Amino acid sequence: GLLIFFLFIGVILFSSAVYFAEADERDSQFPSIPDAFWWAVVSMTTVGYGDMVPTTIGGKIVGSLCAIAGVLTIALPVPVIVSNFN
Amino acid sequence: SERVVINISGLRFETQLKTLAQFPETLLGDPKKRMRYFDPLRNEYFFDRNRPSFDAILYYYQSGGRLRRPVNVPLDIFSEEIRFYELGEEAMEMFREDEGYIKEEERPLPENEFQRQVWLLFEYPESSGPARIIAIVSVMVILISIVSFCLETLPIFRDENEDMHGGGVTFHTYSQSTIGYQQSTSFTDPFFIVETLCIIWFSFEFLVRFFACPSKAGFFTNIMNIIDIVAIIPYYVTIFLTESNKSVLQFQNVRRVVQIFRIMRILRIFKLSRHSKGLQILGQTLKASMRELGLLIFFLFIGVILFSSAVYFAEADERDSQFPSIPDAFWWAVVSMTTVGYGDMVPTTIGGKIVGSLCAIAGVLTIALPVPVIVSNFNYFYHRET
Amino acid sequence: GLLIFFLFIGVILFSSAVYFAEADERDSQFPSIPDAFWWAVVSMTTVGYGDMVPTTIGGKIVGSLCAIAGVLTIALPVPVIVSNFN
Numbered sequence: 001g002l003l004i005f006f007l008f009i010g011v012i013l014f015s016s017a018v019y020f021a022e023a024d025e026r027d028s029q030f031p032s033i034p035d036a037f038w039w040a041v042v043s044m045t046t047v048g049y050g051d052m053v054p055t056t057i058g059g060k061i062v063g064s065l066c067a068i069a070g071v072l073t074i075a076l077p078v079p080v081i082v083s084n085f086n
Numbered sequence: 087s088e089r090v091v092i093n094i095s096g097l098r099f100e101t102q103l104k105t106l107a108q109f110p111e112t113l114l115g116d117p118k119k120r121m122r123y124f125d126p127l128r129n130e131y132f133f134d135r136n137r138p139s140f141d142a143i144l145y146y147y148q149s150g151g152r153l154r155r156p157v158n159v160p161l162d163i164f165s166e167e168i169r170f171y172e173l174g175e176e177a178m179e180m181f182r183e184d185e186g187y188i189k190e191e192e193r194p195l196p197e198n199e200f201q202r203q204v205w206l207l208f209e210y211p212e213s214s215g216p217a218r219i220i221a222i223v224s225v226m227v228i229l230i231s232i233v234s235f236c237l238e239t240l241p242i243f244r245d246e247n248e249d250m251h252g253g254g255v256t257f258h259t260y261s262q263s264t265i266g267y268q269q270s271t272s273f274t275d276p277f278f279i280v281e282t283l284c285i286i287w288f289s290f291e292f293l294v295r296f297f298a299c300p301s302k303a304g305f306f307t308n309i310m311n312i313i314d315i316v317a318i319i320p321y322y323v324t325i326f327l328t329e330s331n332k333s334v335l336q337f338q339n340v341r342r343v344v345q346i347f348r349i350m351r352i353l354r355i356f357k358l359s360r361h362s363k364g365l366q367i368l369g370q371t372l373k374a375s376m377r378e379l380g381l382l383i384f385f386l387f388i389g390v391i392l393f394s395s396a397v398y399f400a401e402a403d404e405r406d407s408q409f410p411s412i413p414d415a416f417w418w419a420v421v422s423m424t425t426v427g428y429g430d431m432v433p434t435t436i437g438g439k440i441v442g443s444l445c446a447i448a449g450v451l452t453i454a455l456p457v458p459v460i461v462s463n464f465n466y467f468y469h470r471e472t
Numbered sequence: 473g474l475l476i477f478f479l480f481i482g483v484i485l486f487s488s489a490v491y492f493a494e495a496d497e498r499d500s501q502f503p504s505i506p507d508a509f510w511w512a513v514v515s516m517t518t519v520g521y522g523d524m525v526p527t528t529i530g531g532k533i534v535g536s537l538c539a540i541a542g543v544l545t546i547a548l549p550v551p552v553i554v555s556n557f558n
Contacts, residue, residue: 003447004447007447038439038442038443041443041446042427042442042446045425045443045446045447045450046425046518047422047425047426047427047446048427048429048520049427049428049429049432050427050429050522051429051432074447074450078450078451078454081451081454081455082454082455082458085455086458086459232484235488235505236484236488236504236505236506237506239491239504239505239506240504240505240506241503241504345492348492349488349489349492352484352485352488352489355481355484355485358481362477364474364477364478365477365481368478368548371548382540383540386540417532417535417536420536420539421520421535421539424518424536424539424540424543425518426515426518426519426520426539427520427522428520428521428522428525429520429522430522430525453540453543457543457544457547460544460547460548461547461548461551464548465551465552468552
């Protein structure tokens, strides 16, 4: 639950940030914040389908932190789960 | 039930005589052997030795056999004590197994004088200096062997023939494509040359090894020798197949097989395990992890089918659904789960995306469970060496 | 060195396999085995750029094992390195 919750928190944060950083663009791939959720989860779990990608500098800086943050968010709860399994 | 007192550097121990007499051949069990340590002024046996260890030595007698090393006592120190008290090689060997060791077997030189001289520079790069030269040459041939196999597919080579612009297909151009090089006692093809030189060497190593080999029984047992056989089977089997089917209609009729054996040539890469410690460790690791490796594949399988089904239905009512069927979605599911995400297949609906989200997360957990164990085993074999 | 070596071994293996599994295709994205090296490393490190992807069943089964194998190949040596760093 913590894993899903943490991901949720990060998703909303980064979805909001990327949205606004690409807001003033005619070619913004982020129609709304809820739309960006898909991108945020895809980057955080580091799946990166590439069907949605920032195009502005700010959006890319936001995307960078989103990948890193995702890696840490997941890496915290899993070890415990792995532990129980073991 | 006469009592016996044993004083270890001041630490006092007592037991019954019949407890020590249980093992008549040991030091404390044999009256003649312990006699030397008896102190008639204090009625006790005195040993100017390591204290922490003795607790276990005495328990060995009391328990009638259990020889456990105390957790707080170094293995080298404890072993010396075991030998001093003369517990015997049977209990010592039994002690090492539990302490994690065992093994230490493997026949020596051939013993055939000269046969045992060749079996040195072809199985033990250690020995002679030249024995190392052979190893270096072997590795070279292998690498070359690999580069050769690979360039064979380079279009810059196979696109320079008779039907490179969409013309007619010749028999010796058709089989030259199926094999990678053209077979001919004329040795016109550079690739057939290198490939033949390498197989000569590999064929040499195999033979030399097979004759200079001591136990002919345990030859096709050693996985290493298996690799050496498979590294040459394609070559000769190809010749046999082509020569046995020298006409177009015949070759085409056996073209599938020929292709299989060309694919089988890649296994020559594993000819490096003989000269690679780490490669050998990895082998031991995988051999020791079959259960978790199977669990890993099984778990992935379960997740794949589940998420493939879910994504399929969530995108079913779409004219632009990238998921034609559930089996199609398998590719996407594995790609998301291993988190590779090629992006060649992606959900487009809300439900499909929620499903995709859980699929990524689930994949991360599915893999993260069995791997740690595998990593563990590897870490074992890797250090039990160095 | 072990890490690079293991990756190398896997690359060549999977590059060869994917190549042949997509050989009889007019739209094969794998021109040769050396070409497929790029794809193999990209899948194994799980980067997945998507600029090269198998299209046949056999090629996809090969790609699947390539991702999994890559995950294990890397996961073996790194723990030790992480250890030394710690």
